[PDB]
Chains A and B, each alone.
Chain A
Amino acid sequence: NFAPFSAFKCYGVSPTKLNDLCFTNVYADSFVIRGNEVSQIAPGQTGNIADYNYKLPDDFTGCVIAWNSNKLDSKVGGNYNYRYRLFRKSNLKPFERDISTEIYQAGNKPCNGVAGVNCYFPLQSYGFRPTYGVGHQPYRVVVLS
């Protein structure tokens, strides 16, 4: 009950045993993604998010918490604030973050810094709208390591 309508899963020991335990540092990572992408915030997953946005290690022992945020993050007309990376020359290493916005050159012609044919801006917006199906609605996610 740290948040509402939550859905949580710990990959190390139970949340109670966390109360006995102590640690030098705790990390809280947070972001928004689609409902159908929450399954990628888990050890061993691959996909657009795991590969190019946020990547947990195979040996992750932490907790992942996600809740539907349709009422807050969806907007009539589309909420264009939330973006994800669709193109990248390599997968991200665990806990890597990439905030670059270089035009992705998919072919052999240069892009001279402008989007065009086979030259793609690397981020895409989710454009969340209240009428999307639950799989496509926004979920807020918190990862505790």
Chain B
Amino acid sequence: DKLWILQKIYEIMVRLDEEGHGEASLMVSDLIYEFMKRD
């Protein structure tokens, strides 16, 4: 379902920030926005 992949994408965003990859975390944030803008 959509909830598992949302959670996995969210987790990558968090992991990237904790590991210091802030810029790549912002890019994953944009994907979360786009994904949820879908139906």
Residues of A within 8 A of B (CB): 34, 46-48, 51-52, 78, 86-87, 106-107, 117-118, 120, 124-129, 132-133, 136
Subset of 17 A-B contacts with CB under 8 Å: A46-B37, A47-B33, A48-B29, A48-B30, A48-B33, A51-B33, A51-B37, A52-B33, A86-B33, A87-B36, A106-B7, A107-B3, A124-B13, A126-B26, A127-B22, A136-B22, A136-B23
**B1-35 to A contact mask, C-beta < 8 Å, 1/0:** 00100110010010001001011011001101100
Q: How far, in whole Å, are A46 and B30 apart by their CA atoms in the complex?
A: 12
Residues of B within 8 A of A (CB): 3, 6-7, 10, 13, 17, 20, 22-23, 25-26, 29-30, 32-33, 36-37
Set of chain B residues within 8 Å of A120, measured between Cβ atoms: 10
Say which residue of A87, A124, A132 sits within 8 Å of B23 (CB atoms).
A132
Q: How far, in whole Å, are A24 and B33 apart by their CA atoms in the complex?
A: 38
- Chain A, interface SS category: loop
Q: In the complex the two chains form, is B3's CB within 8 Å of A118's CB? A: yes
Q: In the complex the two chains form, is B7's CB within 8 Å of A117's CB? A: yes
| Closest CB in chain A relative to B3 CB, distance in Å | 4
Tell me the nearest residue of chain A to B11, going by C-beta.
A117
Q: How far, in whole Å, are A40 and B33 apart by their CA atoms in the complex?
A: 14
| Closest CB in chain B relative to A43 CB, distance in Å | 19
Q: In the complex the two chains form, is A106's CB within 8 Å of B6's CB? A: yes
Most chain A CB neighbours (cut-off 10 Å) among B3, B23, B36, B37: B23
Tell me the nearest residue of chain B to A46, going by C-beta.
B37
Q: How far, in whole Å, are A13 and B33 apart by their CA atoms in the complex?
A: 34
